[PDB]
């Protein structure tokens, strides 16, 4: 997965 940080 990519940068999934909100």
């Amino acid at each position: 997965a990519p940068d999934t940080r909100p």
């Epitope: 997965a1 990519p2 940068d3 999934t4 940080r5 909100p6």
Partner: single-chain antibody
Framework: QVQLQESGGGLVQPGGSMKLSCVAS????????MNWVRQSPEKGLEWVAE??????????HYAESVKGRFTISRDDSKSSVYLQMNNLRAEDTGIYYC????????WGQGTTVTVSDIVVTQESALTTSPGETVTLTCRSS?????????ANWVQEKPDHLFTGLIG???NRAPGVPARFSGSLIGDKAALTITGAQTEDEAIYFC?????????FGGGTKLTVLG
């Protein structure tokens, strides 16, 4: 107000080298991956490189078009990301943007560089009018788009002004109007404007994630008539 500001572009000859810089403010820079994306003279967006966090040993990935020639780096103490470009080619000509956050929420103004196989498909153009519902779509040549492609939607307004609207398929970026929503519909990613407004006349790009790189679609020119 998050701000990204690129610098270092110019007018160079083939074979040369150039280093771009981007300084970030208004968010916790060190907690997010950063990317470079470029826009060529034929108006298309192309993802160039990403850099991950200190906790990922600053891992990097590149588009095959620049692998071995470009180097992405970052300095968290200066809130800055860099792109070293070697062996420049005419095809590297474009506007270079630094961008990141969920996953392309924030974009700088861009710095111009003039040097002198998955396909993502979007509708070339759609026409709507104020108050209508319009849905833009984003198809992958690999097969069905799923949540594992982490679809993003980005808006280009005049003068090369990019704003991320949606990331992770359906997560609206902070401050983005509620009329914008992301979905998956019939094996494609989709952006819906529920009640289009005159100011929504713009070019809309989707980007899809494939394990370790992004592919941007060709963009949809949305006209809002009346």
């Amino acid at each position: 107000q998050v701000q990204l500001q690129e610098s270092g572009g110019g007018l160079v000859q083939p074979g040369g080298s150039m280093k771009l810089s981007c300084v970030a403010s208004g968010f916790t820079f060190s907690n997010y991956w950063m990317n470079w994306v470029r826009q060529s003279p034929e108006k298309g967006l192309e993802w160039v490189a990403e850099i991950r966090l200190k906790s990922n040993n600053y891992a990097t990935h590149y588009a095959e078009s620049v692998k071995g020639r470009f180097t992405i780096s970052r300095d968290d103490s200066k809130s800055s990301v860099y792109l070293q470009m070697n062996n420049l080619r005419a095809e590297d000509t474009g506007i270079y943007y630094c961008t990141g956050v969920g996953q392309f929420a924030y974009w700088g103004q861009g710095t111009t560089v003039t040097v002198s196989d998955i396909v993502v498909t979007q509708e070339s153009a759609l026409t709507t009018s104020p108050g209508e519902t319009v849905t833009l779509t984003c198809r992958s040549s690999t097969g069905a788009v799923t949540t594992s492609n982490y679809a993003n939607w980005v808006q280009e307004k005049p003068d090369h002004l990019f704003t991320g609207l949606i990331g992770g398929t359906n997560n609206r970026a902070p401050g983005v109007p509620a009329r914008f929503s992301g979905s998956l519909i019939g094996d494609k990613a989709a952006l819906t404007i529920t009640g289009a407004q005159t100011e929504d006349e713009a070019i809309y790009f989707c980007a899809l994630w494939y394990s370790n790189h992004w592919v941007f679609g060709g963009g949809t020119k949305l006209t809002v008539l009346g």
